[PDB]
Coordinates of C-alpha atoms and ligand atoms in Angstrom, one line a residue:
Chain F
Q1065 CA 52.9 93.3 -68.2
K1066 CA 51.2 90.1 -69.0
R1067 CA 49.5 88.8 -65.9
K1068 CA 48.7 85.1 -65.4
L1069 CA 46.3 83.8 -62.8
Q1070 CA 48.0 83.4 -59.4
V1071 CA 47.1 82.7 -55.8
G1072 CA 45.2 85.6 -54.3
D1073 CA 43.5 86.6 -57.6
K1074 CA 39.7 87.0 -57.5
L1075 CA 37.4 84.8 -59.6
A1076 CA 33.6 85.1 -60.0
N1077 CA 30.7 83.7 -62.0
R1078 CA 27.6 85.5 -63.1
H1079 CA 25.5 84.2 -60.2
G1080 CA 27.2 86.1 -57.4
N1081 CA 29.7 83.3 -56.5
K1082 CA 33.1 84.9 -55.9
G1083 CA 36.4 83.9 -54.4
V1084 CA 40.2 84.2 -54.5
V1085 CA 42.5 81.5 -55.9
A1086 CA 44.1 79.8 -52.8
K1087 CA 45.8 76.8 -54.5
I1088 CA 47.0 75.9 -58.0
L1089 CA 47.3 72.2 -58.4
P1090 CA 49.3 70.2 -60.9
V1091 CA 47.3 68.4 -63.6
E1092 CA 47.9 65.0 -62.0
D1093 CA 46.5 66.1 -58.6
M1094 CA 43.1 67.3 -59.9
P1095 CA 40.0 65.1 -60.0
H1096 CA 39.5 63.6 -63.4
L1097 CA 36.8 61.9 -65.4
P1098 CA 37.0 58.1 -66.1
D1099 CA 38.2 59.1 -69.6
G1100 CA 41.2 60.9 -68.2
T1101 CA 40.0 64.5 -68.4
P1102 CA 40.9 66.6 -65.4
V1103 CA 38.7 69.3 -64.1
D1104 CA 39.9 72.9 -64.2
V1105 CA 38.2 74.4 -61.1
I1106 CA 36.9 73.0 -57.8
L1107 CA 34.1 74.9 -56.1
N1108 CA 32.8 74.3 -52.6
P1109 CA 29.2 73.2 -52.4
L1110 CA 28.8 74.8 -49.0
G1111 CA 28.6 78.2 -50.6
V1112 CA 25.3 77.4 -52.4
Chain N
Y1446 CA 38.4 59.8 -59.6
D1447 CA 41.0 61.3 -57.2
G1448 CA 44.2 62.1 -59.0
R1449 CA 46.3 61.5 -56.0
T1450 CA 45.1 58.0 -55.1
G1451 CA 43.3 56.8 -58.2
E1452 CA 40.3 55.8 -56.1
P1453 CA 36.9 57.2 -56.9
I1454 CA 35.2 59.8 -54.8
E1455 CA 32.8 57.9 -52.7
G1456 CA 29.8 59.7 -54.1
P1457 CA 28.9 61.0 -57.6
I1458 CA 30.0 64.6 -58.1
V1459 CA 28.3 67.5 -60.0
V1460 CA 30.8 68.2 -62.9
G1461 CA 30.0 70.7 -65.6
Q1462 CA 31.2 73.6 -67.6
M1463 CA 30.9 77.1 -66.1
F1464 CA 31.7 80.6 -67.2
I1465 CA 34.1 82.3 -64.7
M1466 CA 35.6 85.8 -64.8
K1467 CA 38.9 87.1 -63.6
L1468 CA 38.0 90.3 -61.7
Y1469 CA 40.0 93.5 -61.5
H1470 CA 40.9 92.9 -57.8
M1471 CA 44.4 91.4 -58.0
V1472 CA 46.8 90.7 -55.1
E1473 CA 49.6 92.1 -57.2
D1474 CA 48.2 95.6 -56.9
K1475 CA 47.3 95.3 -53.2
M1476 CA 50.3 93.8 -51.4
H1477 CA 52.2 96.6 -49.6
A1478 CA 54.7 96.6 -46.8
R1479 CA 56.7 99.4 -45.1
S1480 CA 59.4 99.7 -42.5
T1481 CA 60.1 103.4 -42.6
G1482 CA 59.2 106.1 -45.1
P1483 CA 57.6 109.5 -45.6
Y1484 CA 56.0 111.3 -42.7
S1485 CA 53.4 114.0 -42.5
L1486 CA 54.2 117.7 -42.1
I1487 CA 52.3 118.8 -38.9
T1488 CA 51.7 115.5 -37.0
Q1489 CA 55.0 113.8 -38.3
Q1490 CA 53.1 110.5 -38.5
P1491 CA 53.6 108.1 -41.4
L1492 CA 51.7 108.9 -44.6
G1493 CA 49.0 106.5 -45.8
Chain P
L678 CA 49.6 34.6 -59.1
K679 CA 51.5 34.0 -62.3
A680 CA 53.1 36.7 -64.4
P681 CA 50.5 38.8 -66.3
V682 CA 50.5 38.9 -70.0
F683 CA 51.3 42.4 -71.5
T684 CA 49.4 43.5 -74.6
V685 CA 50.1 46.6 -76.7
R686 CA 47.7 48.4 -79.2
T687 CA 49.0 51.5 -80.8
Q688 CA 47.4 54.0 -83.3
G689 CA 50.3 55.7 -85.0
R690 CA 52.6 57.8 -82.8
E691 CA 50.0 59.5 -80.7
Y692 CA 47.7 56.9 -79.1
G693 CA 48.3 53.6 -77.5
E694 CA 46.6 51.1 -75.2
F695 CA 48.6 48.8 -72.8
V696 CA 46.9 45.9 -71.1
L697 CA 48.1 44.0 -68.1
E698 CA 46.1 41.0 -66.9
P699 CA 45.4 39.2 -64.7
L700 CA 46.4 41.1 -61.5
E701 CA 45.7 40.6 -57.9
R702 CA 42.6 42.5 -56.5
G703 CA 43.6 46.1 -56.0
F704 CA 46.7 46.1 -58.2
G705 CA 45.0 47.9 -61.0
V706 CA 45.0 51.1 -59.0
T707 CA 48.3 50.3 -57.3
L708 CA 50.1 50.1 -60.7
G709 CA 47.9 52.4 -62.8
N710 CA 47.8 55.6 -60.7
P711 CA 51.6 56.0 -60.0
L712 CA 52.2 55.6 -63.7
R713 CA 49.6 58.2 -64.6
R714 CA 51.1 60.8 -62.2
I715 CA 54.6 60.2 -63.6
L716 CA 53.3 60.2 -67.2
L717 CA 51.5 63.5 -66.7
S718 CA 54.4 65.4 -65.1
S719 CA 57.8 63.8 -65.5
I720 CA 58.3 62.8 -69.1
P721 CA 60.9 65.0 -70.9
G722 CA 59.9 66.8 -74.1
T723 CA 60.7 69.7 -76.4
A724 CA 59.1 73.2 -76.4
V725 CA 59.6 76.6 -77.9
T726 CA 61.6 78.6 -75.3
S727 CA 62.4 81.9 -77.2
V728 CA 61.4 83.6 -80.4
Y729 CA 63.1 86.4 -82.2
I730 CA 61.2 88.4 -84.8
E731 CA 63.1 90.9 -87.0
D732 CA 62.0 94.5 -86.4
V733 CA 60.1 93.5 -83.2
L734 CA 61.2 94.7 -79.8
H735 CA 58.7 93.1 -77.5
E736 CA 55.6 90.9 -77.7
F737 CA 53.1 93.8 -77.2
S738 CA 53.4 94.9 -80.8
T739 CA 52.1 94.2 -84.3
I740 CA 54.0 93.6 -87.6
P741 CA 53.1 95.5 -90.8
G742 CA 51.4 93.2 -93.3
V743 CA 50.8 90.5 -90.7
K744 CA 47.2 90.0 -89.4
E745 CA 48.2 88.7 -86.0
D746 CA 50.0 90.5 -83.2
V747 CA 53.1 89.1 -81.6
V748 CA 51.1 87.7 -78.7
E749 CA 48.9 85.7 -81.0
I750 CA 51.9 84.4 -82.9
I751 CA 53.6 83.2 -79.7
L752 CA 50.4 81.4 -78.7
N753 CA 50.5 79.6 -82.1
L754 CA 54.1 78.7 -81.6
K755 CA 53.3 77.1 -78.2
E756 CA 51.4 74.5 -80.1
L757 CA 54.4 73.6 -82.3
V758 CA 55.5 70.0 -81.9
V759 CA 59.1 69.4 -82.7
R760 CA 60.7 65.9 -82.5
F761 CA 64.5 65.5 -82.0
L762 CA 65.8 62.5 -83.8
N763 CA 69.2 62.7 -81.9
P764 CA 69.1 61.8 -78.2
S765 CA 72.0 64.0 -77.4
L766 CA 70.5 67.1 -79.0
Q767 CA 69.5 69.8 -76.4
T768 CA 68.6 72.9 -78.4
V769 CA 67.8 74.0 -82.0
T770 CA 66.9 77.2 -83.8
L771 CA 64.3 77.1 -86.5
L772 CA 64.4 79.8 -89.2
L773 CA 61.3 81.1 -91.0
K774 CA 61.5 83.7 -93.9
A775 CA 58.2 84.4 -95.5
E776 CA 56.8 87.1 -97.8
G777 CA 53.2 88.0 -98.2
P778 CA 50.6 87.1 -99.3
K779 CA 50.5 83.6 -97.9
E780 CA 49.4 81.4 -95.0
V781 CA 52.6 80.6 -93.1
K782 CA 52.4 77.1 -91.5
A783 CA 54.8 75.1 -89.5
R784 CA 56.0 73.5 -92.7
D785 CA 57.6 76.8 -93.7
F786 CA 60.4 76.4 -91.2
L787 CA 63.8 75.7 -92.9
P788 CA 64.8 72.0 -92.5
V789 CA 67.2 71.1 -89.7
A790 CA 69.3 68.0 -89.2
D791 CA 67.8 65.5 -86.8
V792 CA 64.7 67.7 -86.3
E793 CA 61.2 66.9 -87.5
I794 CA 58.1 68.9 -87.2
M795 CA 55.2 66.8 -86.1
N796 CA 52.4 69.2 -87.1
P797 CA 53.4 70.7 -90.5
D798 CA 49.9 72.2 -91.0
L799 CA 50.0 74.3 -87.8
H800 CA 48.9 77.8 -88.7
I801 CA 51.4 80.5 -87.5
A802 CA 50.5 83.8 -89.2
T803 CA 48.6 85.3 -92.1
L804 CA 50.7 87.6 -94.3
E805 CA 49.2 90.3 -96.5
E806 CA 50.8 91.6 -99.6
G807 CA 53.8 93.7 -98.5
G808 CA 54.2 91.9 -95.2
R809 CA 57.3 90.0 -94.2
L810 CA 58.0 87.5 -91.4
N811 CA 61.7 86.7 -90.5
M812 CA 61.9 85.0 -87.2
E813 CA 64.1 82.5 -85.3
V814 CA 62.4 80.1 -82.9
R815 CA 64.5 78.4 -80.3
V816 CA 63.3 74.9 -79.3
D817 CA 64.7 73.3 -76.1
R818 CA 64.4 70.0 -74.3
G819 CA 63.2 69.6 -70.7
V820 CA 60.6 68.5 -68.3
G821 CA 57.6 70.2 -66.7
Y822 CA 56.2 73.7 -67.2
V823 CA 58.8 76.5 -67.0
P824 CA 57.3 80.0 -67.3
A825 CA 59.1 82.6 -69.3
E826 CA 59.6 84.5 -66.1
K827 CA 61.8 81.7 -64.8
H828 CA 64.1 80.7 -67.6
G829 CA 64.1 84.1 -69.3
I830 CA 66.0 82.7 -72.3
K831 CA 67.0 85.2 -75.0
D832 CA 69.4 84.2 -77.8
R833 CA 69.8 87.9 -78.6
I834 CA 68.8 91.3 -77.3
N835 CA 65.2 91.5 -78.7
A836 CA 64.4 87.8 -78.3
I837 CA 61.1 87.1 -76.4
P838 CA 61.0 84.4 -73.8
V839 CA 58.1 81.9 -74.1
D840 CA 56.5 79.9 -71.4
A841 CA 57.7 76.3 -71.9
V842 CA 55.4 73.2 -71.5
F843 CA 57.8 70.4 -72.1
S844 CA 55.5 67.5 -71.4
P845 CA 54.9 65.4 -74.5
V846 CA 52.0 63.5 -72.9
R847 CA 48.6 65.0 -73.6
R848 CA 46.2 62.8 -71.7
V849 CA 46.4 59.6 -69.5
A850 CA 43.6 57.3 -68.5
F851 CA 43.6 53.8 -67.0
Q852 CA 40.8 51.3 -66.8
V853 CA 40.3 48.5 -64.3
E854 CA 38.1 45.6 -65.5
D855 CA 36.8 42.6 -63.6
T856 CA 38.8 39.7 -65.1
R857 CA 38.8 36.1 -63.8
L858 CA 41.5 33.4 -63.9
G859 CA 40.7 29.9 -62.9
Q860 CA 38.3 29.9 -59.9
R861 CA 39.5 33.3 -58.5
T862 CA 37.1 36.0 -59.7
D863 CA 38.4 39.2 -57.9
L864 CA 41.3 39.6 -60.3
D865 CA 42.1 43.0 -62.0
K866 CA 42.6 43.9 -65.6
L867 CA 44.6 47.1 -66.0
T868 CA 44.4 49.1 -69.3
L869 CA 46.5 52.3 -69.7
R870 CA 45.5 54.8 -72.3
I871 CA 48.1 57.3 -73.3
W872 CA 47.8 60.3 -75.6
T873 CA 51.0 62.0 -76.8
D874 CA 51.8 64.8 -79.2
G875 CA 53.7 62.4 -81.5
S876 CA 57.3 63.5 -80.6
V877 CA 57.3 60.7 -78.1
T878 CA 55.3 57.5 -78.8
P879 CA 53.0 56.3 -76.0
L880 CA 55.1 53.2 -75.6
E881 CA 58.3 55.3 -75.2
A882 CA 56.5 57.4 -72.5
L883 CA 55.3 54.3 -70.7
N884 CA 58.8 52.8 -70.6
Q885 CA 60.3 56.1 -69.3
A886 CA 57.6 56.3 -66.7
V887 CA 58.3 52.7 -65.5
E888 CA 62.0 53.5 -65.3
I889 CA 61.3 56.6 -63.2
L890 CA 59.2 54.6 -60.8
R891 CA 61.7 51.8 -60.7
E892 CA 64.5 54.3 -60.0
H893 CA 62.6 56.0 -57.2
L894 CA 61.9 52.6 -55.5
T895 CA 65.7 52.1 -55.2
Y896 CA 65.7 55.2 -52.8
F897 CA 64.2 53.0 -50.0
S898 CA 67.6 51.6 -49.4
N899 CA 70.7 52.4 -47.3
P900 CA 68.6 53.4 -44.2
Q901 CA 70.2 55.8 -41.7
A902 CA 69.6 56.0 -38.0
Chain C
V785 CA 32.5 41.3 -34.9
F786 CA 36.0 42.9 -34.8
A787 CA 38.6 42.2 -32.1
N788 CA 39.9 45.8 -32.1
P789 CA 39.7 49.1 -34.0
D790 CA 42.7 48.3 -36.2
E791 CA 41.0 45.1 -37.5
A792 CA 37.8 47.1 -38.2
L793 CA 39.6 49.7 -40.2
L794 CA 41.5 47.1 -42.1
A795 CA 38.2 45.6 -43.2
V796 CA 37.2 49.1 -44.3
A797 CA 40.4 49.5 -46.3
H798 CA 39.6 46.2 -48.1
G799 CA 36.0 47.4 -48.8
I800 CA 34.4 44.8 -46.6
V801 CA 32.4 47.4 -44.7
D802 CA 31.8 51.1 -44.9
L803 CA 32.6 53.7 -42.2
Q804 CA 28.8 54.2 -41.8
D805 CA 28.0 50.5 -41.3
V806 CA 27.0 49.5 -37.7
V807 CA 29.1 46.5 -36.6
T808 CA 30.5 45.1 -33.4
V809 CA 33.9 46.2 -32.2
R810 CA 35.9 45.5 -29.0
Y811 CA 37.4 48.7 -27.7
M812 CA 38.8 49.4 -24.3
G813 CA 37.5 46.2 -22.8
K814 CA 33.9 46.8 -24.1
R815 CA 32.1 45.1 -26.9
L816 CA 30.7 48.2 -28.5
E817 CA 28.1 48.2 -31.3
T818 CA 29.0 51.2 -33.4
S819 CA 30.3 52.0 -36.9
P820 CA 34.0 52.0 -38.0
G821 CA 33.6 55.7 -38.5
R822 CA 32.8 56.4 -34.9
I823 CA 35.6 54.1 -33.7
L824 CA 37.9 56.1 -36.1
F825 CA 36.7 59.4 -34.5
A826 CA 37.5 58.1 -31.0
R827 CA 41.0 57.2 -32.1
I828 CA 41.4 60.7 -33.6
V829 CA 40.7 62.4 -30.3
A830 CA 42.7 59.8 -28.3
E831 CA 45.9 60.4 -30.4
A832 CA 45.5 64.2 -30.4
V833 CA 45.5 64.3 -26.6
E834 CA 47.7 61.2 -26.3
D835 CA 45.4 59.8 -23.6
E836 CA 43.1 56.9 -24.4
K837 CA 41.3 57.0 -21.0
Chain Z
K1306 CA 67.7 67.7 -61.6
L1307 CA 67.4 66.8 -57.9
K1308 CA 70.0 64.6 -56.3
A1309 CA 69.2 61.3 -54.7
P1310 CA 67.0 61.7 -51.6
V1311 CA 68.0 60.6 -48.0
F1312 CA 66.3 57.7 -46.4
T1313 CA 66.2 57.8 -42.6
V1314 CA 64.6 55.1 -40.3
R1315 CA 63.3 55.6 -36.7
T1316 CA 62.1 52.2 -35.4
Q1317 CA 61.0 51.6 -31.8
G1318 CA 60.8 47.9 -31.1
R1319 CA 59.6 45.4 -33.6
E1320 CA 56.1 46.9 -34.1
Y1321 CA 56.4 50.6 -35.0
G1322 CA 58.6 52.5 -37.3
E1323 CA 59.0 55.9 -39.1
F1324 CA 60.7 56.2 -42.4
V1325 CA 61.5 59.6 -44.1
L1326 CA 62.5 60.1 -47.7
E1327 CA 63.6 63.6 -48.8
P1328 CA 63.9 65.7 -50.8
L1329 CA 61.6 64.5 -53.5
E1330 CA 60.3 66.1 -56.7
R1331 CA 56.9 67.9 -56.5
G1332 CA 54.1 65.4 -56.1
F1333 CA 56.3 62.2 -55.6
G1334 CA 55.3 61.9 -52.0
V1335 CA 51.9 60.9 -53.1
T1336 CA 53.2 58.9 -56.1
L1337 CA 55.3 56.7 -53.8
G1338 CA 53.3 56.8 -50.6
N1339 CA 49.9 55.7 -51.9
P1340 CA 51.1 52.6 -53.8
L1341 CA 53.2 51.4 -50.8
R1342 CA 50.3 51.8 -48.3
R1343 CA 48.1 49.7 -50.5
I1344 CA 50.7 47.0 -50.9
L1345 CA 51.5 47.1 -47.2
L1346 CA 47.8 46.6 -46.2
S1347 CA 47.0 43.8 -48.6
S1348 CA 50.1 42.0 -50.0
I1349 CA 52.5 41.2 -47.1
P1350 CA 52.3 37.4 -46.4
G1351 CA 51.2 36.4 -43.0
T1352 CA 49.5 33.8 -40.8
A1353 CA 46.1 33.9 -39.1
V1354 CA 43.6 31.7 -37.3
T1355 CA 41.1 30.5 -40.0
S1356 CA 39.1 28.0 -38.0
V1357 CA 38.6 27.0 -34.3
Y1358 CA 37.0 23.9 -32.7
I1359 CA 35.7 23.9 -29.2
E1360 CA 34.3 20.7 -27.6
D1361 CA 30.6 20.8 -26.8
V1362 CA 30.2 24.2 -28.6
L1363 CA 27.6 24.2 -31.4
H1364 CA 27.6 27.7 -32.8
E1365 CA 29.6 30.9 -32.4
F1366 CA 26.9 32.7 -30.5
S1367 CA 26.5 30.2 -27.7
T1368 CA 28.3 30.2 -24.3
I1369 CA 30.6 27.6 -22.7
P1370 CA 29.6 26.5 -19.2
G1371 CA 32.4 27.0 -16.7
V1372 CA 34.3 29.7 -18.6
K1373 CA 33.9 33.5 -18.2
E1374 CA 34.3 34.3 -21.9
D1375 CA 31.7 33.2 -24.4
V1376 CA 32.4 31.8 -27.8
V1377 CA 32.4 35.2 -29.5
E1378 CA 35.0 36.6 -27.0
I1379 CA 37.3 33.6 -27.4
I1380 CA 37.2 33.8 -31.2
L1381 CA 38.0 37.5 -30.8
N1382 CA 41.1 36.7 -28.6
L1383 CA 42.2 34.1 -31.2
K1384 CA 42.1 36.8 -33.9
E1385 CA 44.8 38.6 -31.9
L1386 CA 47.1 35.6 -31.9
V1387 CA 50.4 36.2 -33.6
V1388 CA 52.1 33.0 -34.8
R1389 CA 55.2 32.7 -37.1
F1390 CA 56.0 29.7 -39.3
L1391 CA 59.8 29.0 -39.2
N1392 CA 59.6 26.6 -42.1
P1393 CA 58.8 28.1 -45.6
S1394 CA 57.5 24.6 -46.6
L1395 CA 54.9 24.7 -43.7
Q1396 CA 51.6 25.8 -45.1
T1397 CA 49.1 25.1 -42.2
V1398 CA 49.1 23.8 -38.7
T1399 CA 46.7 23.0 -35.9
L1400 CA 47.3 24.3 -32.3
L1401 CA 45.9 22.1 -29.5
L1402 CA 44.9 23.5 -26.2
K1403 CA 43.5 21.4 -23.3
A1404 CA 43.0 23.4 -20.2
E1405 CA 41.5 22.8 -16.7
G1406 CA 39.9 25.3 -14.4
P1407 CA 40.4 27.6 -12.7
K1408 CA 43.6 28.7 -14.6
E1409 CA 43.7 31.7 -16.9
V1410 CA 44.5 30.2 -20.3
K1411 CA 47.3 32.0 -22.1
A1412 CA 48.6 31.7 -25.6
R1413 CA 51.6 29.9 -24.1
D1414 CA 49.4 27.0 -23.2
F1415 CA 49.3 25.7 -26.8
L1416 CA 51.1 22.5 -27.3
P1417 CA 54.5 23.3 -29.0
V1418 CA 54.8 22.5 -32.7
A1419 CA 57.9 22.2 -34.8
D1420 CA 59.1 25.4 -36.5
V1421 CA 56.1 27.3 -35.1
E1422 CA 56.5 30.3 -32.8
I1423 CA 53.9 32.2 -30.7
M1424 CA 55.1 35.8 -30.9
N1425 CA 52.8 36.9 -28.0
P1426 CA 52.7 34.1 -25.5
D1427 CA 51.1 36.3 -22.8
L1428 CA 48.0 36.7 -24.8
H1429 CA 44.8 35.9 -22.8
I1430 CA 42.6 33.3 -24.3
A1431 CA 39.9 32.4 -21.7
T1432 CA 39.3 32.2 -18.0
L1433 CA 38.1 28.9 -16.5
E1434 CA 36.2 28.3 -13.2
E1435 CA 36.1 25.2 -11.0
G1436 CA 34.7 22.5 -13.2
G1437 CA 35.4 24.3 -16.5
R1438 CA 36.9 22.4 -19.4
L1439 CA 38.4 24.0 -22.6
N1440 CA 39.2 21.5 -25.4
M1441 CA 40.0 23.7 -28.4
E1442 CA 41.5 23.1 -31.8
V1443 CA 42.8 26.2 -33.7
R1444 CA 43.9 26.0 -37.4
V1445 CA 46.5 28.5 -38.5
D1446 CA 47.0 29.1 -42.2
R1447 CA 49.2 31.3 -44.4
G1448 CA 47.8 34.1 -46.5
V1449 CA 47.6 37.9 -47.2
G1450 CA 45.1 40.6 -46.6
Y1451 CA 41.8 40.3 -44.7
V1452 CA 39.5 37.4 -45.5
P1453 CA 36.0 37.3 -43.8
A1454 CA 34.9 34.0 -42.3
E1455 CA 32.0 33.7 -44.7
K1456 CA 34.4 34.1 -47.6
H1457 CA 36.9 31.3 -47.0
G1458 CA 34.5 29.2 -44.8
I1459 CA 37.3 26.9 -43.8
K1460 CA 36.3 24.0 -41.5
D1461 CA 38.5 21.1 -40.4
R1462 CA 35.7 19.1 -38.7
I1463 CA 32.0 19.2 -38.2
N1464 CA 30.9 22.0 -35.8
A1465 CA 34.1 23.9 -36.5
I1466 CA 33.7 27.7 -36.5
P1467 CA 35.3 29.6 -39.4
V1468 CA 36.9 32.7 -38.1
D1469 CA 37.9 35.9 -39.9
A1470 CA 41.5 35.6 -41.1
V1471 CA 43.7 38.6 -40.3
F1472 CA 46.6 37.5 -42.5
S1473 CA 48.3 40.9 -42.8
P1474 CA 51.2 41.4 -40.3
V1475 CA 50.8 45.2 -41.0
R1476 CA 48.3 46.6 -38.5
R1477 CA 48.1 50.2 -39.8
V1478 CA 49.8 52.5 -42.3
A1479 CA 49.9 56.3 -42.3
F1480 CA 52.0 58.3 -44.7
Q1481 CA 52.5 62.1 -44.7
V1482 CA 53.8 64.5 -47.3
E1483 CA 55.4 67.8 -46.3
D1484 CA 56.6 70.8 -48.3
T1485 CA 60.3 71.2 -48.2
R1486 CA 62.9 73.3 -50.1
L1487 CA 66.5 72.8 -51.3
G1488 CA 67.9 76.3 -52.0
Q1489 CA 65.7 78.1 -54.5
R1490 CA 63.5 75.1 -55.1
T1491 CA 60.4 75.4 -52.9
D1492 CA 58.0 72.7 -54.3
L1493 CA 59.9 69.7 -53.0
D1494 CA 58.2 66.9 -51.2
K1495 CA 59.1 65.2 -47.9
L1496 CA 57.6 61.7 -47.5
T1497 CA 57.1 60.2 -44.0
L1498 CA 55.8 56.7 -43.8
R1499 CA 54.6 55.3 -40.5
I1500 CA 53.9 51.5 -40.2
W1501 CA 52.4 49.6 -37.3
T1502 CA 52.9 45.8 -37.3
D1503 CA 51.9 42.9 -35.1
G1504 CA 55.6 42.0 -34.5
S1505 CA 55.9 38.9 -36.6
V1506 CA 57.6 41.1 -39.3
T1507 CA 59.4 44.3 -38.4
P1508 CA 58.0 47.5 -40.0
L1509 CA 61.3 47.8 -42.0
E1510 CA 60.9 44.2 -43.2
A1511 CA 57.3 45.0 -44.4
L1512 CA 58.5 48.2 -46.1
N1513 CA 61.3 46.2 -47.9
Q1514 CA 58.8 43.6 -49.0
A1515 CA 56.3 46.2 -50.2
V1516 CA 59.0 47.9 -52.3
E1517 CA 60.0 44.5 -53.8
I1518 CA 56.3 43.7 -54.7
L1519 CA 56.0 47.1 -56.5
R1520 CA 59.4 46.5 -58.1
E1521 CA 58.4 43.0 -59.3
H1522 CA 55.2 44.3 -60.8
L1523 CA 56.9 47.0 -62.7
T1524 CA 58.9 44.4 -64.6
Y1525 CA 55.6 43.0 -66.0
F1526 CA 55.6 45.9 -68.5
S1527 CA 58.5 44.2 -70.3
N1528 CA 57.5 41.8 -73.2
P1529 CA 54.6 43.1 -75.4
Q1530 CA 52.3 40.4 -76.6
Ligands
LIG840 MG1 54.0 71.1 -77.0

């Protein structure tokens, strides 16, 4: 079975920051750069 | 910019490119529910 | 404030700039953002929905003489851009029959009436001597992103459903400049930048977006207690 | 100097002042000297409990 | 696709109303709600006090002898005045108020003018003591949005005090988007729009005007160059 990322799946980076996906947003709801590029992931600064 | 309103976030944000991993812990493998099912031999309590 | 002048600057069928000026202060975001959201989600397009490869049962397999596995081939097909020249056309089946050795591109599909491939140079598979690739790719028309698990479309038994991303719009950006008319200096200049895959021109997408917003505004009528 | 919180938050909507700017507002019969953000917080609590006093 | 949504209205009096539109496509609650809130708060035509004249008063920060309220408090009360022009041709007026102590001056004490209505005649202006005299000239204009006094700086006579112009009849807007379903569709939106007004225009009237403003602006994307 080919598993796609879904809510409740666990993501992590190499620096010990880990978490589960809680929300998948449509492309038009994400914050975007002035050139129209939307970001892919939003991380809380309170974890740092 | 905020994709919902089109207004900028009131402060500059740290945006960048980060390497993130999808870990082996998936909610697909962990969600479990039971109403009734197998029971133990001696104690007759539900299995685990 | 008088009626703004509308200016259009287009680069081919894939990029376009649309300028509306002068506007009242704050109307750049009032007009620009609702259009961006509609452009990025609600513009109908065409996408590959199902692929059938001869002698292939599922997508977790390889083909003799073909360098790529079925999973990689389907990923290549998801980048195929197909333009329907007939507004009433809802579905098509593109046929590809290739023998190795060769680089099979999107230009290798057999021609169909009222169907145009917008990226003929798209690489699909690499065939080695003794390899053959006979497949039927079904291209449908729709809106949004429909995963293969939802539509589950199979024209035949061994066909493989493909996740469908129907949106023809690739990127949308709008710019608000500080224009001035007469003695009023707080006016807005709105510039919409639209990137499409070529099947729909940016002007066509903008017109469709405006109609969708106009149609939704008619819903604030016939109030009920 | 704002006649009431609604006028103060209307000015914030138009970008005249920020939530953190200290201005003069008339609220509950008092000419307070606070920011629109603190007046907004007071309205948040008042509406949640549905009792301004 | 989805069928036309249902529009319900729950209006209490002439100053508060709730409007629900549902079901909507995913994300259209924000697409419709945000533009309407912006138009409601800045584009609905209204009237406001833009200048006041008080006999013997030099600057806004002084105090009138014989009246409880100071100049700042009186101007604050005037900013709460709701006046409606019954004539579309009428652009500006001046309300005259001559009062003698020790009465409590109300908004009803203004000399009646043709095709001008005080929506709140019980509004308290000032309190006079024995020997207190209030000779006041208030200039009412037509406009939209919020304009600070230092911006327009409108003075009819020397020693006139410009006053912040609260033109917008809409006092506050708060819209809400809820997740709803229609059968097997679970990503539908439910839009609830709540509008507070000063009473000169009903919340429904403001909502209809806001929709028309957005509808009119959408027609500007019509004639390129
Ligand atoms: Mg595509």
